[PDB]
Amino acid sequence: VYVPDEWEVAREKITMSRELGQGSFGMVYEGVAKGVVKDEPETRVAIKTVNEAASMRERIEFLNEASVMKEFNCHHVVRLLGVVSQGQPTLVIMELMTRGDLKSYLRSLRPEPPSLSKMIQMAGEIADGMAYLNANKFVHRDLAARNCMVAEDFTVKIGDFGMTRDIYETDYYRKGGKGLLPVRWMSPESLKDGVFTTYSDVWSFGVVLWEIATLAEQPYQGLSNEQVLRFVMEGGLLDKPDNCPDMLFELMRMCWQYNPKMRPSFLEIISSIKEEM
Template structure:
């Protein structure tokens, strides 16, 4: 992996709290300074690679981020930057405040303690599949646990 214009200085990143386990390591909520505008803080998701990961796994982790650099679609979580220098490597992504689709849908069940009324999910999500197809991209693990829900229910 060669650092490029997506590289972000580690000093601009602050970890706030743990969100969950990702395929390569932990995912945290964080703050990034200066990603959108100079001096402005942006809430982000920070994917990390496990400290016990092999060099091959670390490279795969950064290569996954490289693939995301090409995507510009409202229905694909947006890559905001990469911290490849030092350990752990971080992939900085748009924060999806409502979590994964599987957990979100389970929270809507009538027996859920704090279920939400109705399900205002986006009806435009099917536009995602022609977009991925046009970009010759195959996800290989498309499941509700890997679909994220944004603040506006997209």
């Protein structure tokens, strides 16, 4: 069960354009929306949707994951703008991040070195969103560059585009043939016991920093999914990226302490980069 509220907006006011990709519950689109932002008759939006052919309790699961965003007010987490629970298909409308996911954005820079400054900006802008989420008692459990989102001004925001895009099929393993797992981005304790925490979010952040420093290479390129498990669970780590600044590899290491209680908080990460400006 879900009860509509003041977030509800009318299907009429929402246009869909070109598709953005396959979501957990449906296709996702680019669009425009009216009367959803103050002094702004039109607003470009991401329209997340459901397949008419999905369960009623999956249309309920879909809405109650958007109900979590109603609580948030951080400029580094992608903004919930409205809901359309009434009728078919069921929609959520969000802030449109006009440069898409951090992984495509970094990959688009290969054939052209980004400055320590810019890499440390991006790093602080990810760590701000995550600090907020961790404090509003939210564990991302799929923090990766492909789940960060980039604004027209190049500011980075935490988002989540699910585990279902064709484009990043390499980044997921159906372990034991169960559900998809982003094994390359997972803490040793997430891999062994299925323990997701703030602290395992800090591990995924270490791998995002690696992704920024490598321009989104595949972590542990040349190991199989089962070989990644073995390597990380026995205390293995990623190598210093080529041309990696000292300050940014030391962040990485901190985030990859085997003992979760040894990794720093996002709050401590922000403090740590702040004494570097």
